[PDB]
Design an enzyme around this catalytic site. Structure first.
Site, PDB file in Angstrom:
ATOM      1  N   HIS A  96       0.331  -1.434   0.270  1.00 46.69           N
ATOM      2  CA  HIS A  96      -0.081   0.192   0.003  1.00 46.69           C
ATOM      3  C   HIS A  96       0.612   1.265   0.139  1.00 46.69           C
ATOM      4  O   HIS A  96       1.785   1.320   0.961  1.00 46.69           O
ATOM      5  CB  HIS A  96      -0.550  -0.171   1.467  1.00 46.69           C
ATOM      6  CG  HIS A  96      -2.380   1.402   0.829  1.00 46.69           C
ATOM      7  ND1 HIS A  96      -3.347   0.878   0.643  1.00 46.69           N
ATOM      8  CD2 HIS A  96      -1.372   2.432   1.011  1.00 46.69           C
ATOM      9  CE1 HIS A  96      -4.276   1.797   0.523  1.00 46.69           C
ATOM     10  NE2 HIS A  96      -3.362   3.127   1.113  1.00 46.69           N
ATOM     11  N   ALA A  97       0.342   2.030  -0.944  1.00 48.24           N
ATOM     12  CA  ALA A  97       1.784   3.079  -1.987  1.00 48.24           C
ATOM     13  C   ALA A  97       1.567   4.004  -0.518  1.00 48.24           C
ATOM     14  O   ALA A  97       0.991   4.041   0.599  1.00 48.24           O
ATOM     15  CB  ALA A  97       1.665   3.955  -2.620  1.00 48.24           C
ATOM     16  N   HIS A 114       0.150  11.859  -6.319  1.00 52.96           N
ATOM     17  CA  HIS A 114      -0.825  11.940  -4.766  1.00 52.96           C
ATOM     18  C   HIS A 114       0.002  11.398  -3.218  1.00 52.96           C
ATOM     19  O   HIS A 114       0.437  12.710  -2.460  1.00 52.96           O
ATOM     20  CB  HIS A 114      -1.721  10.541  -4.701  1.00 52.96           C
ATOM     21  CG  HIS A 114      -1.867  10.549  -3.297  1.00 52.96           C
ATOM     22  ND1 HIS A 114      -3.124  11.596  -2.434  1.00 52.96           N
ATOM     23  CD2 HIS A 114      -2.211   9.908  -1.601  1.00 52.96           C
ATOM     24  CE1 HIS A 114      -3.717  11.319  -1.555  1.00 52.96           C
ATOM     25  NE2 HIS A 114      -2.269  10.600  -0.711  1.00 52.96           N
ATOM     26  N   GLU A 115       1.574  10.819  -3.956  1.00 49.36           N
ATOM     27  CA  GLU A 115       2.548  10.789  -2.499  1.00 49.36           C
ATOM     28  C   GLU A 115       3.144  11.766  -2.452  1.00 49.36           C
ATOM     29  O   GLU A 115       4.264  12.069  -1.552  1.00 49.36           O
ATOM     30  CB  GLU A 115       3.125   9.517  -3.423  1.00 49.36           C
ATOM     31  CG  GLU A 115       2.344   7.733  -2.217  1.00 49.36           C
ATOM     32  CD  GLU A 115       1.305   7.429  -1.624  1.00 49.36           C
ATOM     33  OE1 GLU A 115       2.192   8.229  -0.514  1.00 49.36           O
ATOM     34  OE2 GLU A 115       0.179   7.440  -1.363  1.00 49.36           O
ATOM     35  N   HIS A 158       2.476  15.269  -0.916  1.00 50.78           N
ATOM     36  CA  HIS A 158       2.427  14.510   0.676  1.00 50.78           C
ATOM     37  C   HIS A 158       4.814  14.966   1.040  1.00 50.78           C
ATOM     38  O   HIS A 158       4.871  15.937   1.607  1.00 50.78           O
ATOM     39  CB  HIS A 158       2.494  12.934   0.851  1.00 50.78           C
ATOM     40  CG  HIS A 158       1.527  12.449   1.940  1.00 50.78           C
ATOM     41  ND1 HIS A 158       0.570  12.503   2.582  1.00 50.78           N
ATOM     42  CD2 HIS A 158       0.723  11.845   0.863  1.00 50.78           C
ATOM     43  CE1 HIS A 158      -0.437  12.560   2.562  1.00 50.78           C
ATOM     44  NE2 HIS A 158      -0.454  11.577   1.118  1.00 50.78           N
ATOM     45  N   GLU A 218      -3.633  15.199   2.357  1.00 52.92           N
ATOM     46  CA  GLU A 218      -3.571  15.043   1.265  1.00 52.92           C
ATOM     47  C   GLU A 218      -4.174  14.970   0.280  1.00 52.92           C
ATOM     48  O   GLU A 218      -4.743  14.604  -0.371  1.00 52.92           O
ATOM     49  CB  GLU A 218      -5.226  13.684   2.374  1.00 52.92           C
ATOM     50  CG  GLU A 218      -4.883  12.736   3.172  1.00 52.92           C
ATOM     51  CD  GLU A 218      -3.676  12.105   2.912  1.00 52.92           C
ATOM     52  OE1 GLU A 218      -3.345  11.438   1.831  1.00 52.92           O
ATOM     53  OE2 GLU A 218      -2.636  11.370   3.931  1.00 52.92           O
ATOM     54  N   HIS A 231      -6.487   0.837   5.585  1.00 60.37           N
ATOM     55  CA  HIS A 231      -6.766   1.928   7.076  1.00 60.37           C
ATOM     56  C   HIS A 231      -7.415   1.896   8.257  1.00 60.37           C
ATOM     57  O   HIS A 231      -6.912   2.166   9.420  1.00 60.37           O
ATOM     58  CB  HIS A 231      -7.620   3.491   6.279  1.00 60.37           C
ATOM     59  CG  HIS A 231      -6.556   3.777   4.751  1.00 60.37           C
ATOM     60  ND1 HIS A 231      -6.509   3.607   3.691  1.00 60.37           N
ATOM     61  CD2 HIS A 231      -5.700   4.969   5.305  1.00 60.37           C
ATOM     62  CE1 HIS A 231      -6.502   4.010   2.891  1.00 60.37           C
ATOM     63  NE2 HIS A 231      -5.129   5.375   3.604  1.00 60.37           N
ATOM     64  N   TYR A 237      -9.124  12.209   3.766  1.00 59.46           N
ATOM     65  CA  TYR A 237      -9.869  12.262   3.215  1.00 59.46           C
ATOM     66  C   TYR A 237     -11.293  12.879   2.120  1.00 59.46           C
ATOM     67  O   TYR A 237     -11.439  13.451   1.306  1.00 59.46           O
ATOM     68  CB  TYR A 237      -9.391  10.191   2.472  1.00 59.46           C
ATOM     69  CG  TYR A 237      -8.094  10.165   3.134  1.00 59.46           C
ATOM     70  CD1 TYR A 237      -7.233  10.061   1.835  1.00 59.46           C
ATOM     71  CD2 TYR A 237      -8.227   9.211   3.941  1.00 59.46           C
ATOM     72  CE1 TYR A 237      -5.856   9.567   1.956  1.00 59.46           C
ATOM     73  CE2 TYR A 237      -6.871   8.085   3.926  1.00 59.46           C
ATOM     74  CZ  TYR A 237      -5.434   8.589   3.006  1.00 59.46           C
ATOM     75  OH  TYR A 237      -4.906   7.607   3.393  1.00 59.46           O
TER      76      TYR A 237
HETATM   77  C1  LIG Z   1      -2.353   5.532  -2.009  1.00 56.96           C
HETATM   78  C2  LIG Z   1      -3.006   6.581  -0.422  1.00 56.96           C
HETATM   79  N1  LIG Z   1      -1.929   5.819   0.555  1.00 56.96           N
HETATM   80  C3  LIG Z   1      -1.692   7.017   1.860  1.00 56.96           C
HETATM   81  C4  LIG Z   1      -1.008   5.922   3.668  1.00 56.96           C
HETATM   82  C5  LIG Z   1      -1.459   6.678   4.875  1.00 56.96           C
HETATM   83  C6  LIG Z   1      -0.657   6.193   5.602  1.00 56.96           C
HETATM   84  C7  LIG Z   1      -0.421   6.580   7.205  1.00 56.96           C
HETATM   85  C8  LIG Z   1       0.686   6.609   8.114  1.00 56.96           C
HETATM   86  C9  LIG Z   1       1.394   5.634   8.045  1.00 56.96           C
HETATM   87  C10 LIG Z   1       1.283   4.516   7.219  1.00 56.96           C
HETATM   88  C11 LIG Z   1      -0.003   4.587   5.410  1.00 56.96           C
HETATM   89  C12 LIG Z   1      -2.074   8.478   2.137  1.00 56.96           C
HETATM   90  O1  LIG Z   1      -2.505   8.871   2.676  1.00 56.96           O
HETATM   91  O2  LIG Z   1      -0.668   9.048   0.861  1.00 56.96           O
HETATM   92  C13 LIG Z   1      -4.663   6.311   0.536  1.00 56.96           C
HETATM   93  O3  LIG Z   1      -5.047   5.408   0.796  1.00 56.96           O
HETATM   94  N2  LIG Z   1      -5.503   7.053  -0.127  1.00 56.96           N
HETATM   95  C14 LIG Z   1      -5.529   8.678  -1.164  1.00 56.96           C
HETATM   96  C15 LIG Z   1      -6.821   8.643  -0.847  1.00 56.96           C
HETATM   97  C16 LIG Z   1      -7.609   7.944  -0.498  1.00 56.96           C
HETATM   98  C17 LIG Z   1      -6.690   6.748  -0.095  1.00 56.96           C
HETATM   99  C18 LIG Z   1      -7.300   5.272  -0.296  1.00 56.96           C
HETATM  100  O4  LIG Z   1      -6.830   5.011  -1.488  1.00 56.96           O
HETATM  101  O5  LIG Z   1      -8.614   4.757   0.239  1.00 56.96           O
HETATM  102 ZN   LIG Z   2      -1.721  10.497   1.738  1.00 55.59          ZN
END
Ligand SMILES: C[C@H](N[C@@H](CCc1ccccc1)C(=O)O)C(=O)N1CCC[C@H]1C(=O)O
Ligand SMILES: [Zn+2]
Ligand SMILES: *[C@@H]1O[C@H](CO)[C@@H](O[C@@H]2O[C@H](CO)[C@@H](O[C@@H]3O[C@H](CO[C@H]4O[C@H](CO)[C@@H](O)[C@H](O)[C@@H]4O)[C@@H](O)[C@H](O[C@H]4O[C@H](CO[C@@H]5O[C@H](CO)[C@@H](O)[C@H](O)[C@@H]5O)[C@@H](O)[C@H](O)[C@@H]4O)[C@@H]3O)[C@H](O)[C@H]2NC(C)=O)[C@H](O)[C@H]1NC(C)=O
Ligand SMILES: *[C@@H]1O[C@H](CO)[C@@H](O)[C@H](O)[C@H]1NC(C)=O
Ligand SMILES: *[C@@H]1O[C@H](CO)[C@@H](O)[C@H](O)[C@H]1NC(C)=O
Length: 598
Positions: A321-322, A351-352, A355, A379, A481, A491
């Site tokens: 998970h990215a 997106h990343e 951050h 986000e 999550h 989000y």
């Molecule tokens: C791909 C992205 N990853 C998360 C990661 C969250 C996270 C926080 C703390 C430790 C590990 C992972 C992020 O916001 O970058 C994500 O989960 N996103 C982006 C938009 C909506 C949400 C989804 O896919 O549910």
């Molecule tokens: Zn994010």
């Protein structure tokens, strides 16, 4: 006296912040090592370092009482001290904290290690969510195949961790109360520094909800024409396995079967990306280029040296998970992404990198301010650029979209495609935290936890499981999550405020004028705009040094979270879709689901 003490307090904070950054660097390195390489040894290392940092935080929080900080003249010093008093999980007794960490790693590692058997080959049982299962969910239109993979995944990622999740809820609640919050819901909500934040979101959601109902109705109608009425009913919730996503959070993968005008172009650049020999490296370099084109900060050498941008080819387990990582030094920032060459992934890259840019913009701030103005701000950054990257305007510039004619019908197709990602997501995101809030607050009896999840998914999104579930199943942790204990409201906030940012950046770029037909919001490209970048610099460099309305004010002079911008973006779609649903006598709304047995 207080004048002498405040001077001493300033020196105390300066040293403590630097110490906190250094200690957190060590914790972050251990967490990175575990996420990049899941082993019992790395788990132990990660959790033991966190326990050590938690112990130090307890001492810090205790030491803040020696300072009359609430009496100080400096709003800045008071804000920093307040940040230090907030222990979170670190407020727990030593043993309880250790148990929580073990519970959290058990859930995240379970999620990351899920493997299912091939639908057609019961011998082949090494299919992971990323990329194997997600490929089927996004591409297959065999409803029974889809239902198979849905059940296999939810049973393994969700149900398997019910007891760990239960203990996590108990310990999260215990931690919250030790910080004198009512529950973990209030602890999370505290990050938004606004005692009316929940009501504000309810009000915005209520304004956008009618548009969602129209999209839902139209999609269901189109799915009936594809799968037939034995698979999809006119009046019931949509079977979620048909929506192109494991959690039905975004429906863009089924655009080719639900698009308003199937004879007109629908943007899908994955094939061209592959034809032109795109690699994960190229995708990240292009993201870097977008940011630098706006006069924002170039990715440092550490990023390229240390990031993981492709799934490792050895046998190892990892979290695919990215994610984007700040190591709290100078220029040590990293992404871990199991990157694939698709349009959707190009958006995930941006997106990343949003951050990462935030990390770079505020790295000069004291440690306590090295985070987003609120979790939603963090986000939103990358998604603002993703909105731009997604436009036919931008995609034609980079040679990914060819022979495209942007007539009225192609525009509706593109707006609808965007809405399948942006509007559809809103009720999904709200339910993720409405569910967990209700558990945290003790509003749902343990006997009713699973059907409470599906009840919300039904009430807000109008979707349901492909098969009958019960309290013998436990489906919530099948979402990353939820297993990984990551707050989700960020989000919902993001998907609202990203349009506020995008609209303003587009106006500053000279790319949007509401009175100019040649400059519509849905075709704005902020690539190369120093003026848009300047607004981002002004806001992002602040980090958490000021309450978020001050950060928003730094961007565009506004102080209020508003659904105005998102509604403005989709207004041409709303007009067209309302009419189209009337034209086709489309049923709107849904009956209560029969898919969770109490
Ligand atoms: C791909 C992205 N990853 C998360 C990661 C969250 C996270 C926080 C703390 C430790 C590990 C992972 C992020 O916001 O970058 C994500 O989960 N996103 C982006 C938009 C909506 C949400 C989804 O896919 O549910
Ligand atoms: Zn994010
Ligand atoms: C979450 O909320 C909790 C309350 O529900 C809270 O817990 C309370 O924290 C208080 C600390 O701020 C603490 O107060 C102390 O109480 C001591 C005696 O407590 C005993 O008797 C109580 C019954 O009467 C029981 O309930 C307790 O369990 C104990 O058995 C006092 O000895 C102590 O006093 C000293 O400190 C005060 C404070 O001084 C402050 O600072 C300067 C000096 O540095 C002062 O000039 C200034 O005026 C200011 O007041 C001094 O005035 C005094 O001279 C003593 O040195 C103190 O009052 C309380 O016991 C505790 N529990 C309860 C049940 O009330 C948590 O702290 C909250 N948690 C978080 C994270 O915020
Ligand atoms: C994964 O961790 C193990 C020990 O836990 C270590 O020996 C190994 O080198 C790591 N693997 C990779 C590919 O980094
Ligand atoms: C780039 O940003 C700097 C400050 O970060 C600013 O001074 C400069 O004018 C910007 N460049 C352009 C071309 O606007």
């Amino acid at each position: 006296a207080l004048v002498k003490e405040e001077i001493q307090a300033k020196e105390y904070l300066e040293n403590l912040n630097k110490e906190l950054a250094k200690r957190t660097n060590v914790e972050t390195e251990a967490a990175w090592a575990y996420g990049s390489n899941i082993t019992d040894e790395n788990e132990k290392k990660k959790n033991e370092i966190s326990a050590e940092l938690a112990k130090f935080m307890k001492e810090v929080a205790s030491d803040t009482t020696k300072f009359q900080w609430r009496s100080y003249q400096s709003e800045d010093l008071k804000r920093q001290f307040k940040a230090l008093t907030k222990l979170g999980y670190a407020a727990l007794p030593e043993d309880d904290y250790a148990e929580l960490l073990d519970t959290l790693s058990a859930m995240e590692s379970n999620f990351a290690k899920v493997k299912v058997c091939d639908y057609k080959d019961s011998t082949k049982c090494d299919l992971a969510l990323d990329p194997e299962i997600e490929e089927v969910i996004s591409k297959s239109r065999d409803h029974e195949e889809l239902a198979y993979y849905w059940r296999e995944f939810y049973d393994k990622a969700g149900t398997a961790v019910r007891s760990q999740f239960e203990r996590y809820v108990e310990l999260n609640t215990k931690a919250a109360k030790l910080n004198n919050f009512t529950s973990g819901a209030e602890a999370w909500l505290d990050e938004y520094e606004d005692d009316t934040f929940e009501q504000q979101l309810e009000d915005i959601f209520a304004d956008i909800r009618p548009l969602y109902q129209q999209i839902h109705g139209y999609v269901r109608f189109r799915l009936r024409k594809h799968y037939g009425d034995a698979v999809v009913s006119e009046t019931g919730p949509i079977p979620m396995h048909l929506l192109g996503n494991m959690w039905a959070q975004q429906w863009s993968e089924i655009a080719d079967i639900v698009s308003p005008f199937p004879e007109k172009p629908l943007v899908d650049v994955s094939a061209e990306m592959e034809k032109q020999g795109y690699t994960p490296l190229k995708m990240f370099q292009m993201g870097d280029d977008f940011f630098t084109s706006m006069n924002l900060t170039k990715l440092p050498q550490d990023f390229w040296d240390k990031s993981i941008i492709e799934k490792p080819t050895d046998g190892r387990d990892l979290v695919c998970h990215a994610s984007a990582w700040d190591f709290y030094l100078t220029d040590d920032v990293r992404i871990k992404q199991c990157t694939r060459v698709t349009q959707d992934q190009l958006f995930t890259v941006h997106h990343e990198l949003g951050h990462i840019q935030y990390f770079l913009q505020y790295q000069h701030q004291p440690f306590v301010y090295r985070t987003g103005a609120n979790p939603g701000f963090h986000e939103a950054v990358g998604d603002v650029l993703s909105l731009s990257v997604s436009t036919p305007k931008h995609l034609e510039k980079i040679g990914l979209l060819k022979d495209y004619v942007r007539d009225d019908e192609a525009r509706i197709n593109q707006l609808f495609l965007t809405a399948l990602d942006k509007i559809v997501f809103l009720p999904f995101a709200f339910t993720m935290d409405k569910y967990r809030w209700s558990l945290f607050r003790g509003e749902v009896d343990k006997a009713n936890w699973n059907c409470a999840f599906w009840k919300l998914r039904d009430e807000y999104s109008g979707i349901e499981p492909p098969v009958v579930r019960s309290e013998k199943d436990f489906d919530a942790p099948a979402k990353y999550h939820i297993s990984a204990d990551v707050e989700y409201l960020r989000y919902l906030v993001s998907f609202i405020i990203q349009f506020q940012f995008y609209k303003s950046a587009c106006i500053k770029a000279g790319q949007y004028d509401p009175d100019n037909v040649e400059l519509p919001l849905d075709n704005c490209d902020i690539y190369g705009s120093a003026a848009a970048g300047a607004a981002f610099h002004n806001m992002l460099s602040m980090g958490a040094s000021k309450p978020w309305p001050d950060a928003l004010e730094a961007f565009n002079g506004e102080r209020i979270m508003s659904g105005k911008a998102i509604a403005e973006y989709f207004e041409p779609l709303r007009v067209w879709l309302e009419a189209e649903n009337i034209k086709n006598n489309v049923h709107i709304g849904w009956t209560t689901s029969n898919k969770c047995v109490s």
